[PDB]
Amino acid sequence: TPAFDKPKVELHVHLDGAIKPETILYYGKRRGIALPADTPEELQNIIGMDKPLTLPDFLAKFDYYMPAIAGCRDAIKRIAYEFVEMKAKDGVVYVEVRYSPHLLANSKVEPIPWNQAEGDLTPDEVVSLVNQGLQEGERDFGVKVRSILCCMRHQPSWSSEVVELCKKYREQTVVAIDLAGDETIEGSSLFPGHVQAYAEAVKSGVHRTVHAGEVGSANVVKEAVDTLKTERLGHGYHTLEDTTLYNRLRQENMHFEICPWSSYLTGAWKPDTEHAVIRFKNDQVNYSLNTDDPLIFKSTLDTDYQMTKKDMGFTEEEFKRLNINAAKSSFLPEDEKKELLDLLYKAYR
Numbered sequence: 001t002p003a004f005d006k007p008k009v010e011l012h013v014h015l016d017g018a019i020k021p022e023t024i025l026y027y028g029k030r031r032g033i034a035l036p037a038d039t040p041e042e043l044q045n046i047i048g049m050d051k052p053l054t055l056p057d058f059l060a061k062f063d064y065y066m067p068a069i070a071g072c073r074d075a076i077k078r079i080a081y082e083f084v085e086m087k088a089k090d091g092v093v094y095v096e097v098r099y100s101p102h103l104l105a106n107s108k109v110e111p112i113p114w115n116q117a118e119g120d121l122t123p124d125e126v127v128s129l130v131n132q133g134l135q136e137g138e139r140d141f142g143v144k145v146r147s148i149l150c151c152m153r154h155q156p157s158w159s160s161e162v163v164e165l166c167k168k169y170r171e172q173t174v175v176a177i178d179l180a181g182d183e184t185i186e187g188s189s190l191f192p193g194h195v196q197a198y199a200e201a202v203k204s205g206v207h208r209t210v211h212a213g214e215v216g217s218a219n220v221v222k223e224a225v226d227t228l229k230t231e232r233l234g235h236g237y238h239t240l241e242d243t244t245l246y247n248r249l250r251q252e253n254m255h256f257e258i259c260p261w262s263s264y265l266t267g268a269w270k271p272d273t274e275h276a277v278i279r280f281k282n283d284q285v286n287y288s289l290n291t292d293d294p295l296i297f298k299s300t301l302d303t304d305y306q307m308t309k310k311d312m313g314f315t316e317e318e319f320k321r322l323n324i325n326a327a328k329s330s331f332l333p334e335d336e337k338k339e340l341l342d343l344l345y346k347a348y349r
């Protein structure tokens with residue numbers, strides 16, 4: 001039953017919310033971290049969702065699984081390897097994947113993530129292993145992979161390690177910075193650790209994306225654009241609350257990272273209304289379709305397309321239009337960006 005059986009691209013998906021239950025539950029055994037269940041199927045039920053949660057309830061899910069994988073050096077490279085296959089099974093020819101170095105680390109990170117004890121595995125080593133997993137992954141499954149390192153809203157003191165990690169591992173495989181986390185923290189956009197991590201990126205031409213607009217206000221989005229200088233938005237749904245902001249960003253041909261299934265499940269979208277993507281579709285916006293976290297949302301790429309295929313009208317034409325846009329909007333070098341594009345064109349006709 002796949003809603004769109006063509007090659008796809010995906011620009012908004014998190015490593016740490018795309019681990020197989022099997023693998024989480026594997027490192028749980030392999031190292032003594034007691035999880036809330038012992039066969040994969042009920043993990044995917046506990047560590048998964050089907051109503052709007054609360055925000056507390058959502059973050060706590062991260063408190064379950066993460067410490068099985070974080071701190072373990074091979075679970076790292078492994079979730080990365082497993083990630084890439086997960087995508088070839090979706091039909092994706094190009095993915096940028098994101099995650100926070102920090103939150104798979106247990107050494108040289110204040111504060112130590114997830115309640116872990118100290119350690120041996122630094123933020124910087126984290127990225128290295130992710131590169132390996134992902135780029136072996138590329139070689140066997142046939143996906144083009146870049147990564148993207150996430151700044152965290154509630155930790156602007158990490159942010160500098162993030163842009164500089166970005167610079168340290170550039171195309172190999174890192175292409176962009178992000179800002180992610182609770183976008184509802186008061187003033188987190190303009191916290192100086194972040195404003196400067198983003199000005200560093202401009203400076204040293206690392207590409208940029210931001211979650212804004214998802215669960216937070218139009219002003220979150222403008223801060224993103226005007227102050228952190230994003231090239232793309234993470235979700236951006238609330239953009240439509242500010243008509244000039246929207247209008248301008250339609251003039252600017254900005255890229256919105258839509259996540260349709262993601263958004264219902266978060267409250268981000270109110271099940272009564274006109275889904276924002278339907279607007280973006282009717283106004284010809286530059287958006288892309290994305291799962292965001294397929295673990296928590298017990299989902300796959302096809303699920304997102306299915307939601308819109310059958311709940312919101314979307315045609316094959318449209319589906320194709322948006323992978324196009326997605327490719328165009330990628331943080332790939334320009335030579336490779338047009339190579340993606342021609343793949344997509346030959347496959348699309």
Ligand SMILES: CCCCCC(=O)Nc1nc(-c2ccc(O)cc2)c(-c2ccc(O)cc2)s1
Pocket residue numbers: 014016053054055056058059062099100103150180181182183214215266267
């Ligand atoms: C309730 C629905 C709202 C959804 C929107 C939201 O706030 N998203 C978030 N993403 C992460 C996140 C980001 C990157 C990452 O690598 C892992 C998680 C959060 C996090 C979760 C736990 C935490 O300690 C801090 C932020 S909170």
Ligand SMILES: [Zn+2]
Pocket residue numbers: 012013014180211234292
């Ligand atoms: Zn996200």
